[model samples]
Target: SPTLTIYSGRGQSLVEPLVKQFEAETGIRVQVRYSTDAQILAALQEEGSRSPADLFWANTAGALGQASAKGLLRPLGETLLEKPIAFVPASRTWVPVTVRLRVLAYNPDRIKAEELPESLLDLPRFAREKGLVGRVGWTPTYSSFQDMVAGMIALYGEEKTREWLLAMKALAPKAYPSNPAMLDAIRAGEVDLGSTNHYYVVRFRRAGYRLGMHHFRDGDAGNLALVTGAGLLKTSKNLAAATRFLTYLLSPQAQQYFVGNIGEYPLVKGVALDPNLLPLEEALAKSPKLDLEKLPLDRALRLLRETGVL
Candidate 1:
């Protein structure tokens, strides 16, 4: 069997387990180029038609959006394309494998859960009111952060989104190298509150970190949702294997892995999540009403850089 080459944007830890499972079940070998989404996107752009990649297993829709806009992805069929999602881009060039929340993780020992702002719009005001100027944290460079910001701008527009960024910047958010490190800051008492994905807290609690999470289901930008999905690149020499891999992602095995083990929200319905994690219907109701298919990726990058968050 020829190897299926995937240029993956997520960390190796997240994808390795599923890739192994796929290999064992199908007898197809996968060669993954593990790197950040930006690197993978850029390489695809540079390599063009000559790229070795068969699939772009990206970490966020924003990253996939760039490729989709560039027409670098193939139009996937109904088996992989007919997904049950609240919103999908009109292009239908990619399919989301999983979803998760962008949540504000707070230390209940330090901050009262009831007192926290219900709306993300009020975070800046609450911080100013409480004098917690430097007590918050986030990874400014993370794709998830930008993805949420883009969603914010999409829902609230540029002016309001910029205001939020500047306000968060004014709060003097402690910069961490990654989401886990930011979460570490939250646990180590370096900061009382931080912004990160929901699964991080679930993972942390499993590893023994006492923390509380606020969903900010205020129908505002803060309640943003993001997706991790795959795109079958047009350059693929092996459509059969690539199609299998993409369809495999939506299979019970792959979808269940995301919900049961990773604590991520499964896009496919009827897949029960880990008992400790958010339920699918509840997650859908809690998340802000916005389409990942319509998020302004370039505008998001511009706003982040302009606001000094990039």
Candidate 2:
């Protein structure tokens, strides 16, 4: 049995159990390096072919696309390519393991659903009209957040994305370090609304928080669907073992653990969805008009920096 090194951008609590199960079943030891997707992507870019990582399991499509675009990933084998068309990248360098919907989460006590922007493009104007400056929270540095900005760039182009970012920034939206913190701000009344992934709100709601989630109208930028995906490293030394692990991740038990327990939208078929989650197709229908596979990560970062939002 070979030891496999995985660069995981997902949290330890959710990933460790799955790895433990994999090791038990296959007699292969696993070493996981956990970090945010952006950090892991940066490390891979710097390490290049010298990287020790056998697989890259990321929490955002943008990070995976960035690596895939830079030719850091290998084409997955036929077994791993057994995924829905929407869930698989066009390059076939990665496979979606889970889904997360970007949404507007609001504190119902402080804000009404009708007061929210009908489309993502209307956010800046709606904020001023409703005097929502300093009342909305966002995680500017989080990968999912960055991916949503990237979606705007891919769909509407850099100039429009920069304009949107600058307008949103001018409104003085409170910035949090991560989704959980931004949700905490909403719950504490520090902010009335936030842009966050659906699972975070599901966890908070399950924990009895008073937050409410709103999906922007169909094809709205605020309604982006982000995929948490995995790929094989092109320079992997343990290619066979790494490929097995990727297949195992899409297994029924693993898929169940992802959606049924972790509150994500599962990418594999036949897994039961968490009661609070929307069907993958319904979520896709509401997402922004951008190809999930072609997220413009570099352009997004440039726009974020140019607009002083990073």
Candidate 3:
């Protein structure tokens, strides 16, 4: 069989070992080309029908939805898990492989548990009202940030979102390059608190840090139940290999590996979570129901850029 080529935006940490093991079992070589989500989308747009990548292992639904919107992704969902369908597009062009949550990372010593944010708006407001401007950290340039803002636009109206955006500008929160950076800022005490993903907090704990995570309650967009997904490309010639790889990803061992080893939530049914996490359904139950594919990502990006945060 030809070495299956995969364009992965999901990073090399866990995926490399998983794919290598898949190769060992199937006697196939899987070549991985990893890049940022924006770069992957740009490459797919530029490559069109000639892209060498057979499949796209993505890190955010926003990017996957962009590919599907451009008609770059092929329809493929029969063999994938649907439990995480909330995180994927309705077109079935892609399915979720693992899940994460958007949360506030607060320093326990600096802020009391009762003083944490009860909603997304509360965080910025409290930070500013309490005179902590530029103390809070957020990764404004990251696609995940865009996606979270997209969720805000979906849950709250444009006027409300704009209000929040302008307020965010007034706060001038410290900027971080990524989620892990935001977490590090909180750990280093450069900032009192920051916004980041759930996996990031888990990673901090794994590193022996006691960073606290706050879930924005009241069904706010801040408590977004996000997922990292994958899709097959229409121009690929290696459908069998791509399908097999995706199938393996949804299998018992793979699902278990994602939660236990990678500190992410499993997308497959019956897969238990790592002891440190809450039940996935509980968070989803509180999160507002919105189709991620339909979010106005461009509008969110425009707002962020206009605010000088992007």
Candidate with the greatest lDDT versus the true structure: 2
lDDT of each: 0.83, 0.85, 0.80
Q: How many collisions per candidate? A: 0, 0, 0
Q: lDDT tens string, model 2, 219-252?
A: 8888888888899988799988998999888888
Clash count, predicted structure 1: 0
RMSD of each: 2.1, 2.3, 2.2
Residue pairs with colliding backbones in model 3 are none
**Residue 78 Cα positional deviation in candidate 1, in Å, after optimal superposition:** 1.7
Worst 10 contiguous positions by lDDT, candidate 2:
77-86
Q: In candidate 3, what are the lDDT values of residues 230-276, reduced to their tens digit?
A: 88899889989888888888887888889888888886666777666
lDDT of 2: 0.85
Q: Which candidate order results from sorting by TM-score in descending order? A: 1, 3, 2
lDDT of 1 by residue, 204-300 (tens): 8888887788888556677678788899999999899998988888887678888777888877865766755666767777767776766887799
